[PDB]
Amino acid sequence: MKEIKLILTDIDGVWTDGGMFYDQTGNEWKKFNTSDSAGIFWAHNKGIPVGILTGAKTEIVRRRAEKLKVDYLFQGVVDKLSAAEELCNELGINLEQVAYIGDDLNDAKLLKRVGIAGVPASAPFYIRRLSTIFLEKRGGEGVFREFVEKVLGINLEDFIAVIQ
């Protein structure tokens, strides 16, 4: 497993199954999976910061980001590759030292440039073929957790050490 210094992730279609709940009054919901917070846990356990990139801008995601202690949150992103580059240069790392997971069209550019590109099984075929590792899980099923565990080579020894 190649050395990683940054994990970026998309939200919708990764942290969720793409569901967007509208009510009659202009409110909106997302369904996260508690399983994904272990992604943050494993990352921080290994001293790796985690960033979120999202085209949308919601209080929904901002609260979730906050509670999970994500290192970086970037909502309203127009160009994900662009936002990723800014942050890399900000952190003095390059894209090759980055792991990214996204599920749709606006992810494809960044996915093509990163050290490890992950895509959920639920994603469309032309995006899915951009992944450089296989992810069994679908968005919403803890696929962020799967990505992180595979990217940092988490193993039974790590597990054993954290429950002692």
Is residue 78 part of the contact set for its own copies (CB under 8 A)? no
Indicate which single residue of 13, 39, 51, 120 sits in contact with Mg ion (rule: CB under 5 A).
Answer: 13
- The helix/strand/coil state of 88 is helix
For its own copies, the binding residues in 99-138 under the rule CB under 8 A are 104-105, 108-109, 124, 126
75 within 8 A of 57, measured Cβ to Cβ: yes
Instruction: Count the Cβ atoms, other than its own, within 10 Å of residue 91.
Output: 16
Q: What angle do CA 137, 95, 61 make, to 5 degrees?
A: 50
Q: Which stretch, 1-9, 24-32, 69-77, 90-98, contacts its own copies (CB under 8 A)? A: 24-32
Size of residue set near its own copies by CB under 8 A: 42
C-alpha distances (whole Å) from 61 to each of 55, 57, 74 are: 11, 8, 10
What is the rounded distance in angstroms from the CA atom of residue 144 to the CA atom of residue 35? 8
* Closer by beta carbon to its own copies, 92 or else 110: 110
Smallest separation, CB 79 to its own copies (Å):
10
Token pair 């994603």: residue: 123
Indicate which single residue of 19, 82, 89, 153 sits in contact with its own copies (rule: CB under 8 A).
Answer: 19
82 within 8 A of 109, measured Cβ to Cβ: no
* Closer by beta carbon to Mg ion, 13 or else 140: 13
64 binds, among Mg ion, its own copies, none (CB under 5 to 8 A by kind): its own copies
What is the rounded distance in angstroms from the CA atom of residue 6 to the CA atom of residue 11? 16
Q: Which stretch, 12-20, 69-77, 82-90, 94-102, contacts its own copies (CB under 8 A)? A: 12-20
Residues in the chain: 164
Residues that bind its own copies (CB under 8 A): 12-13, 17-35, 38, 41, 58-60, 63-64, 104-105, 108-109, 124, 126, 140, 142, 145, 156, 159, 162-164
